[model samples]
Target: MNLTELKNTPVSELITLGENMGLENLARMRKQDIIFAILKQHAKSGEDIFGDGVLEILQDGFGFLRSADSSYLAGPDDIYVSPSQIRRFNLRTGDTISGKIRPPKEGERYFALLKVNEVNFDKPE
Candidate 1:
């Protein structure tokens, strides 16, 4: 199925779809995670996943961007952004950022935020 079909389809159906295509063990996955997986599979077929999210910095200074529909921890380390990235982009909690994300592969457990195209304060300058 194509992107539109996947987006409109329910999570239960998505799990079934994935299994039908040889993906397994999606029964316990969360709804947003199922959605994330569908997006990634579509991307595997060459679709780009464009995303807009809220930038949230933790107490430690490292941060994660949470979109209206998804969230993530840094790879292994669990910090979303490195210190340099935070400083370079001037990221702050509640900031609105636009970016592209790569979906997790078949054996991959998490999707990665590929690049940030825009960063804007929630309030005007």
Candidate 2:
């Protein structure tokens, strides 16, 4: 479904929808499910919320450089940045940041980066 439709669904209904979609049996499910479920629920609850497309931009995987002395290496957990973006953000080594990594629409594969100002990693108690 389009993002607009997904955003209007309630959380409980989203879970039901997921069950109907057989998402519960999907192996290797991670935070993505929780994120998508929340979005669906928010939509049903009458809160404007986008679906997985937006969440893909919001959440990122944990990444670390191979070595302290070497330049940052791109991996599954790391967001790759273009040379221009790096300059614009004034990014430096040893700085912890969040950004996006995606395969280029064409040409070689690379990541587009946007430095995140806020980070949250808390779990419900």
Best by TM-score: 1
lDDT of 1 by residue, 1-125 (tens): 33334556787888987777666778887755666666766678776765555667788876666544445433321214445666777777777766566765568655555666677833222
Q: Which candidate leads in lDDT?
A: 1
In order of appearance, the predictions have TM-scores of: 0.55, 0.32
Predictions in order: lDDT: 0.60, 0.37
lDDT, candidate 1, equals 0.60
- lDDT by residue (12-107, candidate 2, tens digit) is 665566666445632334433433444344445555431111112112332232222225443332334445443454444455443322322345
Which runs in model 1 stand beyond 4 Å of their true positions?
Answer: 1-29, 67-79, 104-109, 121-125
Mind sharing the TM-score for model 1?
Answer: 0.55
